[PDB]
Design a binder for these strands. Structure first.
Length: 71
RNA sequence: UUUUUUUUUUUUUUUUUUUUUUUUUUCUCCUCUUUUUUUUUUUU
């Protein structure tokens, strides 16, 4: 955007998913095992269960969503 | 005018017992060919 002066503030905003993976959890060991999401060209393969992020983490609609905005 | 006699459905009951899925074979065996092995990168 522009501020009350005229210059161009820059910022990139990445989703802050750290609140649903606690250390030494079961989701955390799971992620530690499945290091990388694998993709074959029909479907994806969710690292998480299939509604924890595929409604609650995706920026859709205009509902509230925890994030991290560097600025 | 035709009297009298020739037995019948085996007797018995008031005996103890401390095991256990199955069960027993078949041999050694020539994997064909552009490669070192590619790899950052970004959009899920």
């Amino acid at each position: 955007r522009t501020l009350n002066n005229g210059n161009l503030e820059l910022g990139v905003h990445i989703a802050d998913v750290t609140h649903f993976v606690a250390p030494n959890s079961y989701i955390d060991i799971e992620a530690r095992t499945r290091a990388t999401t694998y993709y074959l060209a029909d479907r994806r393969y969710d690292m998480l269960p299939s509604v924890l992020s595929a409604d609650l983490c995706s920026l859709l609609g205009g509902v509230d969503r925890y994030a991290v905005s560097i600025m």
